[PDB]
Amino acid sequence: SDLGKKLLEAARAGQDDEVRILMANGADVNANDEYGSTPLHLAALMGHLEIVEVLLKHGADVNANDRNGHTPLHLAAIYGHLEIVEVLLKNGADVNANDLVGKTPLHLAADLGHLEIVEVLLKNGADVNAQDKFGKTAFDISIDNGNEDLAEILQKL
Ligand SMILES: [Ca+2]
Numbered sequence: 001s002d003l004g005k006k007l008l009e010a011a012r013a014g015q016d017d018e019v020r021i022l023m024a025n026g027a028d029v030n031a032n033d034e035y036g037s038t039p040l041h042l043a044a045l046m047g048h049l050e051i052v053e054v055l056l057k058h059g060a061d062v063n064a065n066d067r068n069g070h071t072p073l074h075l076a077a078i079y080g081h082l083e084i085v086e087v088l089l090k091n092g093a094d095v096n097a098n099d100l101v102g103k104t105p106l107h108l109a110a111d112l113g114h115l116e117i118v119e120v121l122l123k124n125g126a127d128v129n130a131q132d133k134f135g136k137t138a139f140d141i142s143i144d145n146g147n148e149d150l151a152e153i154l155q156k157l
């Protein structure tokens with residue numbers, strides 16, 4: 001029986017009770033699939049807050065990269081999952097972690113246009129002037145997208 005594969009599936013699917021049994025049987029909370037996703041990645045992707053919390057207190061790696069370079073915080077940003085963002089920041093996430101195109105969670109939340117997450121990231125240490133691999137800051141992204149409310153927030157001194 002491959003406990004890690006079952007744990008990945010249970011974390012994605014919101015199966016809290018099965019997550020607990022699998023950990024009780026020794027499942028590796030840092031198991032990964034062929035794309036480098038861990039249970040924390042998938043639980044974050046699906047907005048399963050309680051599973052994220054359980055994985056974190058079991059010691060799951062908070063800043064592990066999947067095959068795109070994304071940490072769980074990148075995924076919480078990209079899709080705009082506010083409560084996930086907040087709990088990862090309280091539990092050791094690297095707010096300025098870069099993916100394979102040089103983007104931080106701030107770049108991803110800015111491209112999404114999620115104002116509240118952008119400000120949570122900034123006020124929890126995001127580098128407002130971080131540049132991705134093609135030289136863009138979050139402000140440049142907001143300009144490119146025409147999101148003037150976001151551009152205002154990003155340029156606030
Ligand atoms: Ca602060």
Ligand SMILES: [Cl-]
Binds near residue numbers: 017020021
């Ligand atoms: Cl249980």
